[PDB]
Design a protein around this ligand. Structure first.
Ligand SMILES: CCCCCCCCCCCCCCCCCCCCCCCCCC(=O)N[C@@H](CO[C@H]1O[C@H](CO)[C@H](O)[C@H](O)[C@H]1O)[C@H](O)[C@H](O)CCCCCCCCCCCCCC
Ligand SMILES: *[C@@H]1O[C@H](CO)[C@@H](O[C@@H]2O[C@H](CO)[C@@H](O)[C@H](O)[C@H]2NC(C)=O)[C@H](O)[C@H]1NC(C)=O
Lengths: 274, 198, 98, 117, 240
């Protein structure tokens, strides 16, 4: 029932001459905004993606990032010269806040380098990873020496971040509370051993990500029931496949049980024969 | 340019107060710095104001700042003689150690002494084996230089005798040929008639 | 320090033969630029619609490519990608069953 | 879209004392800063940092002389002007903006006048 | 503090450049600037660290090296007259009050060595007409016939230097208004109370320090080597 805000940032620096920075934002499991290196504005996908903020409470933010986009790039360009970093460069930044019931919450700001995070933001000062290289330490000093930025960030994690979330939940509850009924079926998989076959349980086109699915013999949960990873789709409804290796003679009375919020106890009744 | 400074050149009297302005167009902005370069020496750091810090003072100097209009000024009071140098306006587009520095074209001022009792005169003195001098001039009175390369003429410069609170102008001119007459060595310069010369 | 990716291809509708679209999911690639092409049994599809790339809690990226079609009893589909971790572009053919 | 109410102006004599009003509403923005800027006819000078919630810093010319207060509900702000000086006459503007520069969120009130005799 | 040598220097075109700089505050970042007289400032190079050396907005043929944190000396391979300016090593602290700190600065001048001249000794006893009318006596020192203008004039009274009551001219003046090789000439005044000038026990020395040639530079001409020497002319107090 928790819906964290994940602001995602991707910035690649192949050579000194060329770079691109794009970013987006996830709430819980939904995308609201896209932002290219080509666009001077962040794109509100939903009509309610703007939340409660007026076109000025909104544009104000666009003024910051647009400057922040330009600002961030030179820094790292000169950063690398100070730090002698063999190009190319890949930097990722995960950030946001998550609210607790009532008027309490917590924030975060995790930056990563070449698929390995470097530093975070604790309280009112920059703090590196306990498993971070040293050069990061000298870099930690430099950034802490720009306070207005340090302040500018707390003003966002502390405070302004959560209010906007509240300005979205009231604007997006309808989409938020939406539920989608899955579409399930069965199919044969190639045999993983002699006689013993692989029984596949298919689930597709549902909404709220979290679901529990197990292959069962009426009511007996089958250990061999193995499933893969939940995977997306174009309209935000996901997909999943659960498998099981059993012998043909044991396929009598077997059934795949499907448990998800979209139905409440009217589970997908699929015994072996459909 | 991204930082225009005004005015270029200014001349004021000793003991007066005046102001120095600076206008910048740089985006972004982090801090503003007024510097003072001694003539022929390295400039010195004076005021280092972030954009919150509107005003700041170091001694008889007091600078101001209005970022909303992107405009800086610089107020000094009771101008001393030592204040005479060139002044600069420097902005850093970052707060940490990454900002590019945007210097203004640079202004320069001159604080002249206000002398209450002027007795202009021209003397000639021994050259210990040839040059006449003019001193104690109304600082507002002006000078020109030589018509012909044989004749040499300097410009004004003042002096301070702190032991007895005396501050007086001075000027020198000479040539080598025997035709060097002190009476006419300054004709290119307009001088007052109350000047007495032996 | 370099993770190579993991490809998974699947369809949205269990199709007989019945307009349906298809999805190719890739994740866990440590850098971020990759050349990707969905191939209709030997040939690419220009008209294609993709989404916005992201990464996971381990900062390992992931992305999804989709396209509408009409599947056959005869043709086969696959997902091809050139990455730094691969000298040869690996392909994953779609199973019309599972 | 914001609300502009400035109230509490007037004429006084030397050594007087006054109190000023300011509030905002509509498309507001959680943590923010309000306060005033006086403009001696010539030039707006900071006088009062509000830093909604956050500790604050006055001007040295009014160090301890003047003191502010926060509505803490109606998001309104009150300033207590005490021991006024004659030279302290100027145009006093209320400002509500956030502690990040150059944003379009920098809103300015209609303006209030203060005169000390 | 922050040190860079030497204040003045002169060399021949096409030769290699000695430019030094030192720093005793342990700062990691250092600078170099180029200022032509009467004009603004120009950045040319910088080093964010010990092993960094980078180029500035001005593309130039300089050789910014930094292997040590203290020494940040600039080098230049081949000399050329368009390089004549002033150059200012600079430094900043790794934390707070980024008071960009500057070095003293170095003056640079670079066609032929037969154009160099040491200046004239020159002191001038005052005038009685001034002593009578003003109750004070003015002295003046003069240095002429020299090239280049790398000069440090200093008055000296009774063994000690003095700065109270002096007025050296700000900048020199060419001996020829047209020539580019023109020698220069400057004036320096000094005025004291009469009663002092009378007292014979007072010694007066106008000293001039000339930053001339090196010790190895080949000199062959009719003249003596105009080396870096001190051209001082003195005087004695006189009650007429
Ligand atoms: C979490 C906030 C919540 C916001 C919610 C908005 C939702 C809307 C949809 C969002 C979808 C798009 C999401 C895109 C990803 C968003 C990332 C958010 C990061 C924002 C933090 C920085 C805010 C802008 C601050 C900035 O531009 N700093 C600038 C400007 O600063 C200058 O100008 C300022 C005034 O203009 C100040 O005066 C300052 O003193 C002066 O130096 C400052 O110069 C910074 O140093 C520049 C970089 C900052 C990033 C630091 C990252 C450190 C890690 C990198 C290390 C790499 C080492 C290897 C190379
Ligand atoms: C990302 O966007 C920026 C600006 O939007 C691009 O950089 C500038 O593009 C303009 C186009 O007229 C050039 O004049 C500038 O010289 C560019 N800046 C620099 C520093 O070169 C940038 O190219 C974009 N990135 C990509 C990958 O397209």
């Amino acid at each position: 029932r928790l819906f964290p805000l994940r602001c995602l940032q991707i910035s690649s620096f192949a050579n000194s001459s060329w770079t691109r920075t794009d970013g987006l934002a996830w709430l819980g499991e939904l995308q609201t905004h896209s932002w290219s290196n080509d666009s001077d504005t962040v794109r509100s996908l939903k009509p309610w993606s703007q939340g409660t903020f007026s076109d000025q409470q909104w544009e104000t933010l666009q003024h910051i990032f647009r400057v922040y986009r330009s600002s961030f790039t030179r820094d790292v360009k000169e950063f690398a010269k100070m730090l002698r970093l063999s190009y190319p460069l890949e930097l990722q930044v995960s950030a946001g806040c998550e609210v607790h019931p009532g008027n309490a919450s917590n924030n975060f700001f995790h930056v990563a380098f070449q698929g390995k995070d470097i530093l975070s933001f604790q309280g009112t000062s920059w703090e590196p990873t306990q498993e971070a290289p040293l050069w990061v330490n000298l870099a930690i000093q430099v950034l802490n020496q720009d306070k207005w930025t340090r302040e500018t960030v707390q003003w966002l994690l502390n405070g302004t971040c959560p209010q906007f979330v509240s300005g979205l939940l009231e604007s997006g509850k309808s989409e938020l509370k939406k539920q989608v009924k899955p579409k399930a079926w069965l199919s044969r998989g190639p045999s993983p051993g002699p006689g013993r076959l692989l029984l596949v349980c298919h689930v597709s086109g549902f909404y709220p990500k979290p679901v529990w699915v197990k292959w069962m013999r009426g009511e007996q949960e089958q250990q061999g029931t193995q499933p893969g990873d939940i995977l997306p789709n174009a309209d935000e409804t996901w997909y999943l496949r659960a498998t099981l290796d059993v012998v043909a003679g044991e396929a009598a009375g077997l059934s795949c049980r499907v448990k998800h919020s979209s139905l409440e106890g009217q589970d997908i009744v699929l015994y072996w024969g459909s | 340019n991204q930082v225009e400074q005004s005015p270029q050149s200014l001349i004021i009297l000793e003991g007066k107060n005046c102001t120095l302005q600076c206008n910048y167009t740089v985006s972004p902005f982090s801090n503003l710095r007024w510097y003072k370069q001694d003539t022929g020496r390295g400039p010195v750091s004076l005021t280092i104001m972030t954009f919150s810090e509107n005003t700041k003072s170091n001694g008889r100097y007091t600078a101001t700042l209005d970022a909303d209009t992107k405009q800086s000024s610089l107020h000094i009071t009771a101008s001393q003689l030592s204040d005479s140098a060139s002044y600069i306006c420097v902005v850093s587009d970052r707060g940490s150690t990454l900002g590019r520095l945007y210097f203004g074209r640079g202004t320069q001022l001159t604080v002249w002494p206000d002398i209450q009792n002027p007795d202009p005169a021209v003397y000639q003195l021994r050259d210990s084996k040839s040059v006449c001098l003019f001193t104690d001039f109304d600082s507002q009175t002006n000078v020109s230089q030589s018509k012909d390369s044989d004749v040499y003429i300097t410009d004004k410069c003042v002096l301070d005798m702190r032991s007895m609170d005396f501050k007086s102008n001075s000027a020198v001119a000479w040539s080598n040929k025997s035709d060097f007459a002190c009476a006419n060595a300054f004709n290119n310069s307009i001088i007052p008639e109350d000047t007495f010369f032996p | 320090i370099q993770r190579t990716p993991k490809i998974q291809v699947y369809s949205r509708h269990p199709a007989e033969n019945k307009s349906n679209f298809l999805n190719c999911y890739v994740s866990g690639f440590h850098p971020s630029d990759i050349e990707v092409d969905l191939l209709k049994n030997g040939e690419r599809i220009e008209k294609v619609e993709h989404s916005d790339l992201s990464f996971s809690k381990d900062w390992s990226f992931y992305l999804l490519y989709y396209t509408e079609f009409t599947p056959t009893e005869k043709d086969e589909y696959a997902c091809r990608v050139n990455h730094v971790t691969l000298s040869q572009p690996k392909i994953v053919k779609w199973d019309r069953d599972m | 879209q914001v609300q502009l109410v400035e109230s509490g102006g007037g004429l006084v004599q030397a050594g007087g004392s006054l109190r000023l009003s300011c509030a905002a509403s509509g498309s507001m923005f959680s943590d923010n800063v309000m306060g005033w800027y006086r403009q001696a006819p010539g030039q707006r000078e900071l006088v009062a940092t509000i830093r909604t919630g956050g500790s604050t810093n006055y001007a040295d010319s009014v160090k301890g002389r003047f003191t502010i207060s926060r509505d803490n509900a109606k998001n309104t702000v009150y300033l207590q002007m005490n021991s006024l000086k004659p030279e302290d006459t100027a145009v006093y503007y209320c400002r509500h903006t956030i502690p990040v520069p150059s944003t379009p969120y920098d809103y300015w009130g209609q303006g209030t006048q203060v005169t000390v005799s | 503090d922050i040190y860079q040598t030497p204040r003045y220097l002169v060399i021949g075109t096409g030769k290699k450049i000695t430019l030094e700089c030192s720093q005793t505050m342990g700062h990691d970042k250092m600078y170099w600037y180029q200022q032509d007289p009467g004009m603004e400032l120009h950045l040319i190079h910088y080093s964010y660290g010990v092993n960094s050396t980078e180029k500035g907005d001005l593309s130039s043929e300089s050789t910014v090296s930094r292997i040590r944190t203290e020494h940040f000396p600039l080098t230049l391979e081949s000399a050329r007259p368009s390089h004549t300016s002033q150059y200012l090593c600079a430094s900043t602290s790794r934390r707070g009050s980024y008071e960009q700190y500057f070095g003293p600065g170095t003056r640079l001048t670079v066609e032929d060595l037969k154009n160099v001249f040491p200046p004239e000794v020159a002191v001038f006893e005052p005038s009685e007409a001034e002593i009578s009318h003003t109750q004070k006596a003015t002295l003046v020192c003069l240095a002429t016939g020299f090239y280049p203008d790398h000069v440090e004039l200093s008055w000296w009274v009774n063994g000690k230097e003095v700065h109270s009551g002096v007025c050296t001219d700000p900048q020199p003046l060419k001996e020829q208004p047209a020539l580019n090789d023109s020698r220069y000439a400057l004036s320096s005044r000094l005025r004291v109370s009469a009663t002092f000038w009378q007292n014979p026990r007072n010694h007066f020395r106008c000293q001039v320090q000339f930053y001339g040639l090196s010790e190895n530079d080949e000199w062959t001409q009719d003249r003596a080597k105009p080396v870096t020497q001190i051209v001082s002319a003195e005087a004695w107090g006189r009650a007429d």
